[PDB]
Design a protein around this ligand. Sequence first.
Ligand SMILES: N=C(N)NCCC[C@@H](NS(=O)(=O)Cc1ccccc1)C(=O)NCC(=O)NCc1ccc(C(=N)N)cc1
Ligand SMILES: [Ca+2]
Ligand SMILES: [Cl-]
Length: 223
Amino acid sequence: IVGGYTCGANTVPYQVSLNSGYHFCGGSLINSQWVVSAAHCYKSGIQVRLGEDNINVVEGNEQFISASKSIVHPSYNSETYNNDIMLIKLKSAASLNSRVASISLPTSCASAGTQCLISGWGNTKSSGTSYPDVLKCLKAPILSDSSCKSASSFIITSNMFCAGYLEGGKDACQGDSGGPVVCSGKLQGIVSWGSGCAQKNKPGIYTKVCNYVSWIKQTIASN
Ligand SMILES: N=C(N)NCCC[C@@H](NS(=O)(=O)Cc1ccccc1)C(=O)NCC(=O)NCc1ccc(C(=N)N)cc1
Ligand SMILES: [Ca+2]
Ligand SMILES: [Cl-]
């Protein structure tokens, strides 16, 4: 997260770190057994880490749980990042508490102008490299598709939205991938893709979770 702020320990209790020997992606806890992340975060040997603040220190509120199944969206396109979403089932149910909590799925999509909370342990610099140990947060509004398209020249599918600031300086970044965009207590976005980080006229692009609720629900029902 570039141009954000320190969240505060366990202030984003649905925020997950995916670990494969090191933190490599975020995720969102959607019930005691399932995590939503980005399809581009798929890899073998994922351990889900709940209750994290400092990812390099055991602070006492963590739960580390292996993935038992990973389900990449059937239509994930690794060139365009269309359908950039994945479900991860936990080997064991997380113990839910004030610091490890699920986040609700949308009942309907959010609109341009709505303010959202974006979080993760990704790069904090728009130029160069700095990875935080503690969770970072950013408030950012959803942009209209038309303003985003004209500003960036990006192709934005129906399953994507732009959020952030066209002026640059505030954005998600590498390492935030797969993490939450929460708006009015609903998981509306997943950190997906972009062009650099916090650059002018290059806002963050996010998987539009509202389009996947039926898929998530039926997948969970049958797995
Ligand atoms: N030609 C097409 N259509 N390409 C789609 C993929 C574009 C790709 N862009 S990219 O390489 O600039 C992403 C990046 C890599 C290193 C450092 C900063 C940013 C990209 O974003 N790749 C996946 C990725 O790196 N995702 C992580 C990510 C998370 C947040 C942002 C952000 N600025 N909000 C950007 C990338
Ligand atoms: Ca920790
Ligand atoms: Cl529009």
